[PDB]
């Protein structure tokens, strides 16, 4: 298998808003759980041994043995038999304290039709304004249906200069972050989606461009979601993976 190329093709809709994904059409989506099974964050598989997530997801415990990763899932609670559950052996937080972290799996994920890594972007690439991307996860839905199932939403990227305007996020967004969302409201990542992917289709594959991080509420008009800009951390990510 090649990164970023699912074996079940994702559908556009016919996480607040959006729709339930086709099962296994987002095969890099990970559920991050405590040792006792609480889903509290997402993540993205980026190689057989490595998961990318948000650093704030890890504030509850500094010990790798407190965490396990769920791969190949569609449901949140009643997992299918072939799902992979792997304990985490090491945790690496970005060293300038940005909201991104790496989890090393205690055993490499078995790459299957249902478990496939996403592709990383080239270093420091800036996703163009208006690019159509997807977010996925098991987070809160604010009454928009699909609770407990893997959901998706298609969202356009909003360039930082615009989303930092007073009328929107008013200077809060750093250059190592990006904005995505419908400015009229109604679609967003939400609590439980942190750490999961924002992917954009380029040519023939999906490239991981953001990590779900924070927002001013969820799905509010004029308040798009904020994502860690993965391209600004590729050099750090690769250094950790290649040295560990």
């Amino acid at each position: 298998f090649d990164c970023g190329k699912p074996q079940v093709e994702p559908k556009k809709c016919p996480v607040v808003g959006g729709c339930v994904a086709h099962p296994h059409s987002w095969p890099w989506q990970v559920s991050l759980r405590t040792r006792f099974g609480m889903h509290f964050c997402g993540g993205t598989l980026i190689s057989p041994e490595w998961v990318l997530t948000a650093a704030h997801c890890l504030e509850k415990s500094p010990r790798p043995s407190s965490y396990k990763v769920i791969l190949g899932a569609h449901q949140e609670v009643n997992l299918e038999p072939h799902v992979q559950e792997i304990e985490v052996s090491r945790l690496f937080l970005e060293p300038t304290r940005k909201d991104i972290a790496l989890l090393k799996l205690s055993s490499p994920a078995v790459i299957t039709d249902k478990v496939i890594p996403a592709c990383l972007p080239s270093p420091n690439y800036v996703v163009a304004d208006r690019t159509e991307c997807f977010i996925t996860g098991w987070g809160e839905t604010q009454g928009t249906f699909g609770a407990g199932l893997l959901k998706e939403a298609q969202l356009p990227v909003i360039e930082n200069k615009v989303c930092n305007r007073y009328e929107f996020l008013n200077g809060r967004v750093q250059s190592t972050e990006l904005c995505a969302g419908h400015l009229a409201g109604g679609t967003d990542s939400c609590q439980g989606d942190s750490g999961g992917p924002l992917v954009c289709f380029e040519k023939d594959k999906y490239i991981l461009q953001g990590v779900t991080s924070w927002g001013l509420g969820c799905a509010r008009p004029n308040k798009p979601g904020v994502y860690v800009r993965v391209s600004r951390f590729v050099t750090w990510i690769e250094g950790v993976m290649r040295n560990n």
């Binding site: 889903h39 704030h56 997801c57 504030e59 609590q191 439980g192 750490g195 924070w214 927002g215 509420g217």
Partner: peptide, 14 residues
């Protein structure tokens, strides 16, 4: 008003 989207979230006064 900034809330990090973990479950539970981490929310801040702005």
């Amino acid at each position: 008003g900034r809330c990090y989207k973990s479950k539970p979230p981490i929310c801040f006064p702005d």
